[PDB]
């Protein structure tokens, strides 16, 4: 009484409503530090003028 396990399972059945169906989520967090930027886009480099 008043002493519960903090976690609980998801009920994932194929017949579940889309609201209750499982969804995989990846969150990308971008950030700048006291270092050169090491994650860059595919954007091609060019000669310097």
């Amino acid at each position: 009484f008043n002493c519960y396990f903090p976690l609980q399972s998801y009920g994932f059945q194929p017949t579940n409503g889309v609201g209750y169906q499982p969804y995989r989520v990846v969150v990308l967090s971008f950030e700048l530090l006291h270092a050169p930027a090491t994650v860059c886009g595919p954007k091609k480099s060019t000669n310097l003028v």
Partner: nanobody, 127 residues
């Protein structure tokens, strides 16, 4: 997949004691909680006691509370039911049960459908 094998049932006089074991085999890393249920001839199945595999916390029905102790051995993959002060009402077939399901409220395990069942072991309480 898991299989459950009860043992340690039989005859005993009212006011005496008995110890049921149930051995889990198969995918045992999947056990969330275990339960004991009983069913006298001609009456419906009834929840007895549940234990959470991690933490070893126990929930009991009111009819057995203070007389029965549920306990587990993680290492030996076995749940125990220590039945003391046996009574008329205790006579029944006892089933152990396993669920892969984590419920926050331990009480849930009284009413929640379990995943696998043993064949059962008979208990009988003499007059």
């Amino acid at each position: 997949q898991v299989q459950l094998v009860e043992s340690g049932g039989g005859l005993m006089q009212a006011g005496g004691s008995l110890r049921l074991s149930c051995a889990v085999s198969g995918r045992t890393f999947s056990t969330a909680a275990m339960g004991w249920f009983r069913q006298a001839p001609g009456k419906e199945r009834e929840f007895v006691a549940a234990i959470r595999w991690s933490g070893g916390s126990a929930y009991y029905a009111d009819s057995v509370k203070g007389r029965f102790t549920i306990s587990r051995d993680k290492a030996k993959n076995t749940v125990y039911l220590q039945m003391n002060s046996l009574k008329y009402e205790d006579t029944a077939v006892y089933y152990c049960a396993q669920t892969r399901v984590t419920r926050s409220l331990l009480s849930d395990y009284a009413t929640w459908p379990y995943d696998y069942w043993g064949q059962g072991t008979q208990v009988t309480v003499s007059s």
